[PDB]
Amino acid sequence: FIHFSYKPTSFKTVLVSPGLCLSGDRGIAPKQGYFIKQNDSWMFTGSSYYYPEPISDKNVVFMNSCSVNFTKAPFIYLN
């Protein structure tokens, strides 16, 4: 059997958030990725490649509540 694998070669050190607390005390969590901060704006990136992209309903899972250590971000009512 010949197995092919994805191998990373270069790395970067990023500060990430595992969830966000929105207005109405709602929550979002990233769907196989992390929330990063670029130019004082929250953003999404995948976990196996560094590529910032806008937060939309494809990247997140919505929650009618918010966890006790999600990061408070009232600026976001984005796409």
Binding site: M63, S65, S67, V68
Partner: protein, 99 residues
């Protein structure tokens, strides 16, 4: 005679210590890249439990985890199944060597 294994027992204990500590701390290799309690939340939510109840009762979930670990630890007393399975291996080897 009985030969020693090629890896010692402190080595295997270090391997399981590494595998346990890889789920708690912030590379999170053995916990799908998310923190531990978030992994427990998503895993319970995949059974049909809503996110509101899990966001409310996080302290009770952590207390039940601590209680289950303590009940595991205080329970290796003479009627366990795992201790019987461990001692059957040693008894069988000693019986074969004496026979």
């Amino acid at each position: 005679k009985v030969l020693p294994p090629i890896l010692s027992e402190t080595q295997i204990s270090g391997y399981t210590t590494a595998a346990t500590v890889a789920a708690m701390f912030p590379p999170w290799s053995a916990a799908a890249g998310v923190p531990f309690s978030l992994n427990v939340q998503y895993r319970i939510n995949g059974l049909g439990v809503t996110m509101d109840v899990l966001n409310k009762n996080q302290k009770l979930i952590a207390n039940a985890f601590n209680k289950a670990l303590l009940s595991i630890q205080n329970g290796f007393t003479a009627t366990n199944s795992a201790l019987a399975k461990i001692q059957s291996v040693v008894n069988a080897n000693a019986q074969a060597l004496n026979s």
